[PDB]
Amino acid sequence: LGRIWLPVLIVVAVAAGALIVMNVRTVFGSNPVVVTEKTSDNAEDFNPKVVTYEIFGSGSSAVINYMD
């Protein structure tokens, strides 16, 4: 392999250098923004507790104030 050893080794070295370049060149950067994760709850109305106000008396009418 007197006339074969040189070009093969040249190609091997070129491939190794190209691989290293392709990796390290792309390693830089790649972190421009930060996006936080979202964890919300299910907003549904199943079995809601029911509150009832009742006003009654011997009078005809009344003035009522209540807290919703």
């Binding site: 080794l9 040249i10 070295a13 250098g17 370049v21 390290v24 060149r25 390693v27």
Partner: protein
């Protein structure tokens, strides 16, 4: 940092290829490269 790594690797490989082509020997090129690298470390130390 990344550019220093890239430059060192590419320059070493290219210089090794050129020396191997010119001197037609592998061990001679390896010796040249290794000695230059050692001198490089000493240079960094002195400059620092």
């Amino acid at each position: 940092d990344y550019d220093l790594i890239i430059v060192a690797a590419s320059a070493l490989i290219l210089i090794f290829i050129i020396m191997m082509v010119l001197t037609r020997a592998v061990v001679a090129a390896a010796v040249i490269v290794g000695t230059v690298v050692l001198s490089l470390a000493s240079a960094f130390g002195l400059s620092v």
